[model samples]
Target: NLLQFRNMIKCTIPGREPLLAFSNYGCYCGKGGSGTPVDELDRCCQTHDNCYDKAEKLPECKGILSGPYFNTYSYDCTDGKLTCNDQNDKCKLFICNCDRTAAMCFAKAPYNEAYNHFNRQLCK
Candidate 1:
């Protein structure tokens, strides 16, 4: 594997200052010159780049993703109300009644590479 390493990842929002930060991998991967698995680093880098690119072109400076994995919209739920924030955040929202005690709000979508790769459902 051609492991890619970097000390920090930076995101430059259009019309805003660039934000530079290191990854959460305290011991490996995030440190400069340290090698890590290609898939893990590649996925994070690709997703961030894709989202930023979409956000840069948006009229409202919001992130979006339209691909085999990401939805074409953005959404948010606050104060028990759900609202569509952008096209990429679009996903189905539902209240799940758990036997333990309380109900919970969950979101799901049709496509997600990360979820599919891990054979898991997407809940955001």
Candidate 2:
């Protein structure tokens, strides 16, 4: 009976949770949206929010087995570079690319608004 019970027992594999809160730009998620962006860096966040707003749940980003199971993977940030920790399911990288792009766009201080603060240079 014990051997039969063992075979009947269910097996489960724990999985990673999707990291939410990418871009809200409206008092949520990434938050900080005060009706209007406060400055250049804030604007970068807004752009990122826009990206998320328009970001479609592409088939690429969808996990292969998204049903009742945790069809997801982990992400790694290496010196600001985003990569998937799993040997499989690298689709999460798509969102990471957006963040990297917006991040580099920061520090320029909105070219048109003109921040004569003479602050600093922007990353490429």
Candidate 3:
């Protein structure tokens, strides 16, 4: 049901990009008014349930590769206490090749899964 709703919302607003489906702020799509105005980015996320889907579609927002690779350092969360988990300052990488058009590249790449993995490990 939630997925259907998300799809409906996305379809209803055609020609517009999707926003982050989840946010720390109260329910609202696209940045949740976090860093900048909502107009800057299109409405991608409509509900928390569809955040993964929404984020996966975000690389196409600007039609460009925001970065060559998505990198992160290891980190630890012990009893709610957080600390750097990396040794020797090593980092992991998720390569995103945005050589093609935004829609085409993102549709073919695994950037969505990569973003979700990184966000869950670090952001959550």
Candidate 4:
């Protein structure tokens, strides 16, 4: 299963941020030139598939969200058009939560289906 090889980020607002508290999930898809998996989370999607939305309008889904990279993948959904996609958004920081159910849920899944509402936030 791909879930085992995944990572997650536990996010919390220490009462000063004023934002919501959510978790970010990522995966170790593989490595690039080096042997490191580069473990970057994919583009943050809006409609759950297309990655393209203004920073303000973006869902307050994940928090404490520190991934290996920022906006590295496709981040599909909602305003997720080709313009917002940035392949070079790789090589950031990621937190390893490793919980699929929570991950999918954070991504706004309908019924918390493990792989149903994934945002490809993680690489692997």
Best by lDDT: 2
Highest TM-score, which number?
Answer: 2
lDDT of each residue in 51-80, candidate 3, tens digit only: 433434555323233222233334333442
Question: Estimated TM-score per prediction?
Answer: 0.23, 0.39, 0.21, 0.18
lDDT of 4 by residue, 31-83 (tens): 22212222222222222222212222334324343232332233222331111
lDDT of 2 at 36: 55
In lDDT terms, how accurate is model 1?
0.25
Candidate 2 regions exceeding 4 Å error are: 1-29, 32-34, 64-90, 110-124
TM-score of 4: 0.18
Q: Give the local distance difference test score of model 4.
A: 0.25
Candidate 4 versus truth, CA RMSD in Å, comes to: 15.3
- Give candidate 2's whole-model lDDT: 0.38
Give the total clashing residue pairs for model 3: 5
Q: Arrange candidates, best TM-score first.
A: 2, 1, 3, 4
- Model 2 Cα lDDT, one tens digit per residue, 44-106: 666766764443455565544431122333444454343434445434344444444454554
Which regions of candidate 1 deviate over 4 angstroms?
1-37, 62-124
Task: Tell me each candidate's RMSD, in Å, in order.
Answer: 16.1, 15.7, 17.6, 15.3
| Cα lDDT, model 1, residue 4 | 10
- Candidate 1: the clashing residue pairs are 72-87, 72-88, 73-87, 73-88, 73-89, 74-86, 74-88, 74-89
The 0-to-1 C-alpha lDDT of every candidate, in the order given, reads 0.25, 0.38, 0.28, 0.25
